[PDB]
From a paper:
Corresponding to earlier crystal structure data, for all CpI variants a space group of P1 21 1 was observed with two copies in the asymmetric unit cell (chain A and B). In variant E282QCpI, the glutamine residue is potentially stabilized by two hydrogen bonds  (H-bonds) unrelated to the putative PT pathway thus, blocking PT and rendering the enzyme largely inactive. Additionally, the two different conformations of Q282CpI in chain A and B indicate structural flexibility at the entrance of the PT pathway, which may support the residual activity measured for this variant. Corresponding substitutions in CpI and HydA1 had similar effects on H2-release activity, except for variants E282QCpI (8.2%) and E144QHydA1 (0.4%). In case of E282CpI, a substitution for aspartic acid shifted the optimum only slightly to pH 7.5 while an exchange to alanine or glutamine rendered the enzyme most active at pH 7 and 6, respectively.
[FeFe]-hydrogenases represent one of natures’ most effective classes of redox enzymes catalyzing the reversible reduction of protons to dihydrogen (H2) at turnover frequencies of up to 9000 s-11–3. With their low catalytic over-potential, [FeFe]-hydrogenases represent excellent models for a regenerative and likewise economically feasible H2 production. Their active center (“H-cluster”) can be structured into a standard [4Fe-4S]-cluster ([4Fe]H) and a diiron site ([2Fe]H). Theoretical studies suggest that the most probable PT pathway comprises of strictly conserved residues E282, S319, E279, and C299 (from surface to H-cluster, numbering corresponds to CpI), including two protein-bound water molecules (Wat826, Wat1120 4XDC19, chain B) located between E279 and C29915,16,20. In this study, site-directed mutagenesis (SDM) is used to investigate the PT pathway of two [FeFe]-hydrogenases, namely CpI and HydA1, which represent the largest (M3) and smallest (M1) type of monomeric [FeFe]-hydrogenases, respectively.
Author numbering: 2 to 580
């Protein structure tokens, strides 16, 4: 219980690692491959090296403290070891930060500066083509940056339990990649991008849509609509040193105008649309007394999980399009009818916290009359890069508002970005629809928060119903495999692939791992959303006035006829085959 670190004595009953004990006691220990409570078991980076008297050099991140330990974190032996390991990394690292997309927030660069490290022989490949894989609609790899730290492999395992990201033996050398070095899209990968979030450097990235967007903007005849996800207004401010949990909605609208977008709408409008359709489908099922359960279908990471692991549930998914695609569909049909635009000249761009959204947008059948629902999807990070490249002073911009026709949104739509958000929003409408009433108690705190699996009983029209909120792809696996699905009859289930909801999406700003233990990123980003909900006068999707008018004037009644024909999408399992 007694340990000495750099000459300082501590008394403690704690059972923890040297790294965690030292950092709790404000002692600096560097780390690289340690993240998500694990390190690279096979190829330890050893950046967390410390000296334990009587033992030698040990890795602090996976060595437990023991009574009587005398530890030096900053001896010559230690600093030369760490510097040596960083130098070896530089030997396989294309160290050219100028045009690098992690230039502003790279963990490796920070370590190189800290230890004054240099390559024993600079790595300068002639042909990066063999190092880069951009076949995916969603994820790209640049192995000239890869430190083989395993953080993406561990994060895939931890977050999704698919292990789609693996170590591979290629040409007799170790790389990371997909099963058999396939394109990720052709594997059980969810394209959720949690591996990207985990990456300390620029080796993993989103598939860029930025030139699709800039081309559309500069095309004379193109009318470029832009619309951002719920999570974007709660996040993007982090990349302009505005801190965490800042609502920057009004600034984003202003910046998008300054970027030259022709119409400023909002995906939250599409969220209200999804609710209109999905809550209607839920009431339909309640009155048909089936089929049950109905699952949400707005998360393309979860749709891919269902496709790849549970195709028997594909017919249990709501046929309502996701906020992105339903908005997109409306952008090519309703929007011209109220604007005069030639549908073929409309180019619809979304801004998402999500890499999987790019795959969804590019699904061959997400189209009508030769017109894509969505033409481009850029991540939070990409929009930040566009803003910085345009030299727009984001933090000092005035607030503007969205164009109302497809920009208004309710508080129900606003909270989509948090785990349990869709559930809560959908219940607010379904209850009003089924009872043909406008109920006052609308908050469903039971489905909120970061618990991995959330259940609640709701009563609708003198009948009790069972709902569940699955928070993260690994938790969907747990729910199903453990038979939790069978311990009662579920009627409506929300699934999000990313733990925390879209606020923790694969397209979101990276956050430093130590600032990550300072701030709960999942809760602080979500707090912006719930707070908008609390202060909006319209808190149900079906009270959205521009939505109501669009339905009254163009689509008709949700869930039926026109709305069904246009605003819905069904996923179908493959017929039985041998082999
Ligand atoms: N389409 C859509 Fe969604 C909405 O609204 C986003 O835009 Fe999400 C967010 N934020 C993302 O990415 S998707 C999963 N449904 C919940 S939130
Ligand atoms: S990954 Fe980091 S260290 Fe490597 S070139 Fe990019 S910014 Fe520089
Ligand atoms: S995108 Fe998601 S599922 Fe695919 S390798 Fe990365 S973490 Fe795993
Ligand atoms: S892609 Fe990134 S997280 Fe994965 S091993 Fe390479 S450097 Fe580490
Ligand atoms: S939870 Fe949100 S960000 Fe994550 S994969 Fe699903 S839609 Fe994308
Ligand atoms: S951080 Fe401890 S071995 Fe990598
Ligand atoms: Mg370990
Ligand atoms: Mg233009």
């Amino acid at each position: 219980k007694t340990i000495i670190i750099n000459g300082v004595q501590f008394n403690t009953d704690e059972d923890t690692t040297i790294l965690k004990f030292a950092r709790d006691n404000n002692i600096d220990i560097s780390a690289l491959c340690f993240l998500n409570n694990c390190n690279n078991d096979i190829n330890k980076c050893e950046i967390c090296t410390v000296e334990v008297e009587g033992t030698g050099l040990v890795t602090a991140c996976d060595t437990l403290i023991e009574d009587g330990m005398i530890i030096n974190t900053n001896s010559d032996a230690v600093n030369e070891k760490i510097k040596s390991r960083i130098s070896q990394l530089l030997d396989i690292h294309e160290f050219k930060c100028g045009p690098c997309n992690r230039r502003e927030n790279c963990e490796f660069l920070k370590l190189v500066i800290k230890y004054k490290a240099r390559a024993s022989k600079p790595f300068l490949p002639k042909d990066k083509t063999e190092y880069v894989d951009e076949r995916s609609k969603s994820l790209t790899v640049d192995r000239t940056k890869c430190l083989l730290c395993g953080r993406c492999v561990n994060a895939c395992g931890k977050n999704t339990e698919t292990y789609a990201m693996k170590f591979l033996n290629k040409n007799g050398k170790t790389i990371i990649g997909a099963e058999d070095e396939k394109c990720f899209d052709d594997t059980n990968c969810l394209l959720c991008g949690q591996c990207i979030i985990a990456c300390p450097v620029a080796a993993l990235s989103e598939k860029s849509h930025m030139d699709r967007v800039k081309n559309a903007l500069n095309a004379p005849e193109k009318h470029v609509i832009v619309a951002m996800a719920p999570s974007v207004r709660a996040s993007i401010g982090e990349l302009f040193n505005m801190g965490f949990g800042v609502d920057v909605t009004g600034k984003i609208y202003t910046a998008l105008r300054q970027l030259g977008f022709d119409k400023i709408f909002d995906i939250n409008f599409g969220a209200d649309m999804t609710i209109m359709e999905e809550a209607t489908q839920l009431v339909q099922r309640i009155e048909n007394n089936g089929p049950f359960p109905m699952f949400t279908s707005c998360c393309p990471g979860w749709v891919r999980q269902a496709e790849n692991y549970y195709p028997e549930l594909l017919n249990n998914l709501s046929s309502a399009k996701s906020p992105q695609q339903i908005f997109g569909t409306a952008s090519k049909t309703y929007y011209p009818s109220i604007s005069g635009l030639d549908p073929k000249n409309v180019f619809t761009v979304t801004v998402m916290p999500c890499t999987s959204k790019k795959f969804e947008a590019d699904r061959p059948q997400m189209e009508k009359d030769g017109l894509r629902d969505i033409d481009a999807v850029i991540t939070t990070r990409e929009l930040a890069k566009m803003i910085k490249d345009a030299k727009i002073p984001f933090a000092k911009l005035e607030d503007s508002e969205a164009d109302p026709a497809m920009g208004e949104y309710s508080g129900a739509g606003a909270i989509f970005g948090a785990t349990g958000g869709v559930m809560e929003a959908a219940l607010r409408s379904a209850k009003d629809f089924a009872e043909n009433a406008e109920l006052e108690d609308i908050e469903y705190k039971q489905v909120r928060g970061l618990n991995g699996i959330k259940e609640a009983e709701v009563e609708i029209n003198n009948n009790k119903y069972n709902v569940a909120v699955i928070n993260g792809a690994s938790n969907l696996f747990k729910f199903m495999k453990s038979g939790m699905i069978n311990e009662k009859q579920y009627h409506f289930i929300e699934v999000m692939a990313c733990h925390g909801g879209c606020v923790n999406g694969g397209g979101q700003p990276h956050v430093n791992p130590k600032d990550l233990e300072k701030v709960d990123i999942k809760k602080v980003r979500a707090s912006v959303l719930y707070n908008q909900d609390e202060h909006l006068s319209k808190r149900k999707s079906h009270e959205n006035t521009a939505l109501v008018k669009m339905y009254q004037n163009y689509f008709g009644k949700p869930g039926e006829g026109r709305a069904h024909e246009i605003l819905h999408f069904k996923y179908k399992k493959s017929a039985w085959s041998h082999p």
